[PDB]
């Protein structure tokens, strides 16, 4: 069970950015993908979720109108699209597994397994 | 089959417990009943798993007729009977494998449901409700054999009962 | 196998004819008491005077059953063996039906000495079904069934 | 096993239900039990159910001696074997099937208690005693899979226990 | 399963009961298991307990070639396709018999579960507690299928739930 | 499952009729049978039902005396016999098998399924 | 591989008005073999194959 990457991106100033995260070792249908940005020095912010099987996706309210989550099942690669670059979204993409924690008929938390390797993407002129 | 699905997350064993309570979820699986299973499997694959030497010709390079044909019916009827023989046993050898671990599945639900006595109820998916304060070292000891019902059970049957 | 099968050694005797030849011959390797005897269920034909002649019998089925003959083929020691029992230098016994026939050609050579004789029978047996008929014809080296089984 | 006997009344399932309320009785089927034994047993029966051309002589119009008693003895022996397959198959499939049956009806049952919780108790006898109201709807809520054992838990409990 | 050990005092039959009451302890079988136990293992027995007369030569005493050795061939063949079907068929026939008899042990032990209903629990060795005076007559009755529930339902409930 | 009944008979008054009705397709004697009077122009009377292993029998306090039905397990037919004829006996005579519902240990109603022809007696001088 | 076969002079029954018999032979001859057939007498040819 591991997740693959893209390599990293020198983008310029408003601007869009895809980052691409491929699924090997299970049913990449069958689990959710979260994507986390980790500024340089700064803590996790988690952006938003994408459901393989469905297509729905679910957002924060701070992201809102700036990304967009695809899927391809194909090749088992989940996509992040984010517009309106600025100097600001220069950090560490990370595109993580949701496992959730099934007890019977209700779920109770989880945790974030396997972790990808992350990405670098760079906003400068 | 009252159990809906497995758990892809418990790579430590076969079958195993989770559990939630007023500090969190865990997970912990069973050792006795996996080493049962395992036991059994490897019994049943040790014997699955002859020595001629000088035996009749196979293949022949001319017609001949009586004797030929009678070379090459003997060894198709040995090797369509040992098919058959093969695929019975796997069949068989199959059938009782999924049978031996549902069974052994049914043990440990059992087992537990047998161990909380009247201090639990069993919701139906193939797990139970504790109707009392149930902390970690509450969990362990239903799992290890050592657990203890007279010590709940009276906040366990005014919780079950009166409301 | 076709005798132990059959579960019967019942031999009936039957008025085969052999004209011109000499019947009930006998060896010393089958002492049958003090005198020299021979198998029971078979004739050993030989020279009678100085001539062998061509021996052609028939024998039909007008039973309902089937019947086996065994007949043998003598393989004498020498040549003058041969010709001191058959005329013929070389002899030969063919016994047919209508569906099958079987010629024997007799061998001369020294085997090794067995029962103080150094020559060979080669017993052969024949099958006659209901309809069927058995005719024996040799020119000479013909030990000649008495019967059958 | 604890039922007793079939009914010759049910034509429309293999297993089902029967009930008495102040309405009066009703019987109707299950399907999802019905229709797991109809393909338990049709996934076994295409499996029960070979191409030589040409082959040895096997019926003889003479007496000719080893190779006609060679032949007639691989006959016998090929005969004898398949004989012997055939009967265990049949045997061991039957068993299956009445086992497989079985298990069918007792998976029914033990779904059905424990979908009424604390609000039946088990007359042994296949049937249970709904202590409580249960009207036309309320079967067909414990039929088709969604009973709601809360709803009634006060009155079933305040009928079981206290008198 | 539940029950651990077997009892070596019982020589009067496979399967039984042991008590311990008021007036003392006691033990007894019951021959309706026993009996149907015995039925199917001497059934099973009368299944597994052929005239062939001329055969082909199994033993020679001369090098011939091509006959000789398909004859073995053929024989060796033979025997080892029937030591194959030995081996199975007493495998097979082991298997159920155990699990046959451990069916009968557990079929006795939830018919007395659901002759007791609400007045006795289970305490996980096989064995049960009763909640109420149950005199020797009472065992009996509970042995022989005659127990009524309803007259010992108020105190087994009262010493149940209210301490 | 059909009950076949025998034919019309036109007996004399002051005398008895036997009806026949003959089983096929259910073991006959695992059901009760049960023989209905349907009088020309009015509703069905019940009669009685004979207890087709140990051929007990219980009939209607009104033909008490009168009615006396017998089985036949050999060739699975139920026979009715009602003596005294009388005019008001002309009617349509069935055989109808009781089916018992049972809930378990006990019993709680039925129906009658199936029934015969019916034969149609006659009284008259 | 080779046949050589003997005739031998007898009185077989009388069939269809023959005493005398005619036993039947056969011979295979692979790609790239030759038939030679050699008689001093009694031979019944072939007049091609199969």
């Known amino acids: 069970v591991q997740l693959v990457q893209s390599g990293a991106e020198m983008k310029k100033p408003g601007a869009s950015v895809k980052v691409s995260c491929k699924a090997s070792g299970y049913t990449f249908s069958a689990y959710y993908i979260h994507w986390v940005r980790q500024a340089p020095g700064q803590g996790l912010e988690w952006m938003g979720r994408?459901?393989?099987?469905?297509?729905?996706?679910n957002f924060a309210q701070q992201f809102e109108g700036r990304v967009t989550m695809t899927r391809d099942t194909s090749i088992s690669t989940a996509y992040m699209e984010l517009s309106s670059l600025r100097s600001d979204d220069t950090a560490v993409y990370y595109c993580?597994?949701?496992?959730?924690?099934?007890?019977?008929?209700?779920?109770?938390?989880?945790?974030?397994?396997?972790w990808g390797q992350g990405t670098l993407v760079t906003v400068s002129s | 089959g009252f159990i809906e699905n497995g758990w892809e997350g418990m790579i430590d064993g076969w079958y195993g417990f989770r559990h939630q309570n007023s500090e969190g979820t865990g997970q912990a699986a069973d050792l006795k009943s996996t080493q049962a299973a395992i036991d059994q499997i490897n019994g049943k694959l040790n014997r699955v798993i002859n020595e001629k030497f000088h035996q009749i010709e196979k293949e022949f390079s001319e017609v001949e007729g009586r004797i030929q044909d009678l070379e090459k019916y003997v060894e198709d009827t040995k090797i369509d009977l040992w098919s058959y023989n093969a695929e019975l046993l796997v069949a068989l050898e199959n059938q009782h494998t999924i049978d031996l671990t549902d069974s052994e599945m049914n043990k440990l639900f059992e087992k537990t449901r047998r161990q909380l006595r009247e201090n639990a109820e069993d919701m139906g998916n193939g797990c139970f409700k504790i109707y009392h304060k149930c902390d970690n070292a509450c969990i362990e000891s239903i799992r290890n054999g050592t657990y203890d019902h007279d010590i709940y059970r009276d906040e366990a049957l005014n919780n079950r009962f009166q409301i | 196998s076709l005798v132990a099968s059959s579960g019967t050694l019942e031999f009936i005797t039957e008025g085969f004819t052999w004209t011109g030849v000499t019947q009930n011959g006998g060896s010393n390797a089958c002492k049958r008491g003090p005198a020299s005897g021979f198998f029971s269920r078979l004739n050993w034909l030989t020279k009678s005077g100085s001539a062998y002649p061509v021996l052609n019998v028939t024998m039909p089925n007008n039973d309902n059953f089937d019947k086996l003959y065994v007949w043998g083929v003598h393989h004498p020691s020498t040549n003058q063996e041969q010709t001191s029992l058959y005329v013929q230098a070389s002899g030969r016994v063919t016994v047919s039906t209508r569906r099958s026939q079987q010629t024997i050609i007799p061998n001369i050579g020294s085997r090794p000495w067995v029962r103080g004789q150094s020559g060979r029978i080669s017993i052969y047996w024949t099958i006659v079904k209901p309809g069927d008929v058995l005719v024996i014809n040799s020119n000479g080296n013909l030990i000649a069934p008495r019967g059958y089984f | 096993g604890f039922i007793e006997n079939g009914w010759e009344g049910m034509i429309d399932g293999w297993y089902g239900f029967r009930h008495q309320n102040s309405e009066g009785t009703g019987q109707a089927a299950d399907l999802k039990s019905t229709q797991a034994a109809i393909d338990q047993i049709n996934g076994k029966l295409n499996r029960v159910i070979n191409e030589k051309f040409h082959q040895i002589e096997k019926e003889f119009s003479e007496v000719e001696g080893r190779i006609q008693d060679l032949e007639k003895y691989v006959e016998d022996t090929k005969i004898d074997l398949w004989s012997y397959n055939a009967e265990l198959l049949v045997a061991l499939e039957n068993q299956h099937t009445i086992d497989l049956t079985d298990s069918e009806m007792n998976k029914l049952f033990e779904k059905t208690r424990r979908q009424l919780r604390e609000n039946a108790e088990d007359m042994g006898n296949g049937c249970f005693k709904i202590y409580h109201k249960c009207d036309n709807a309320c079967i067909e809520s414990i039929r088709n899979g969604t009973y709601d054992h809360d709803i009634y838990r006060d009155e079933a409990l305040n009928n079981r226990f206290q008198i | 399963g539940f029950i651990e050990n077997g009892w070596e005092g019982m020589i009067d039959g496979w399967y039984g009961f042991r008590h311990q009451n008021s007036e003392g302890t006691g033990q007894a079988a019951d021959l309706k298991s026993t009996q149907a136990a015995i039925d199917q293992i001497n059934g099973k027995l009368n299944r597994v307990i052929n005239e062939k007369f001329h055969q082909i030569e199994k033993e020679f005493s001369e090098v011939e070639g091509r006959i000789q050795d398909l004859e073995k061939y053929v024989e060796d063949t033979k025997i080892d396709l029937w030591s194959y079907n030995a081996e199975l068929l007493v495998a097979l026939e082991n298997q159920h018999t155990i699990d046959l008899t451990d069916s009968e042990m557990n079929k006795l032990f939830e018919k007395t579960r659901r002759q007791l209903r609400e007045n006795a629990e289970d305490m996980g060795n096989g064995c049960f507690k009763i909640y109420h005076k149950c005199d020797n007559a009472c065992i009996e009755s509970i042995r022989n299928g005659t127990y009524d529930h309803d007259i010992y339902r108020d105190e087994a409930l009262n010493n149940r739930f209210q301490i | 499952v059909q009950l076949v009944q025998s034919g019309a008979e036109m007996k004399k008054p002051g005398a008895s009729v036997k009806v026949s009705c003959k089983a096929s397709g259910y073991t006959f004697s695992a059901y009760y049978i049960h023989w209905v009077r349907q009088a020309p122009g009015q509703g069905l009377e019940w009669?009685?039902?004979?207890?087709?292993?140990?051929?007990?029998?219980?009939?209607?306090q009104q033909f008490e005396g009168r009615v006396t039905m017998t089985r036949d397990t050999s060739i699975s037919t139920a026979y009715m016999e009602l003596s005294s004829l009388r005019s008001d006996d002309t009617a349509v005579?069935?055989?109808?098998?009781?089916?018992?519902?049972?809930?378990?240990?006990?019993?709680?109603?039925?129906?009658?399924?199936?029934?015969?022809?019916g034969t149609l007696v006659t009284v008259s001088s | 591989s080779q046949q050589t076969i003997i005739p031998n002079i007898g009185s077989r029954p009388w069939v269809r008005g023959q005493s005398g018999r005619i036993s039947i032979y056969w011979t295979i001859v692979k790609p790239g073999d030759v038939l030679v057939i050699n008689s001093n007498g009694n031979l019944i040819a072939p007049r091609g194959y199969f």
């Open positions: 994408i459901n393989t099987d469905s297509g729905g996706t």
């Open positions: 993580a597994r949701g496992y959730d924690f099934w007890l019977g008929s209700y779920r109770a938390g989880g945790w974030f397994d396997p």
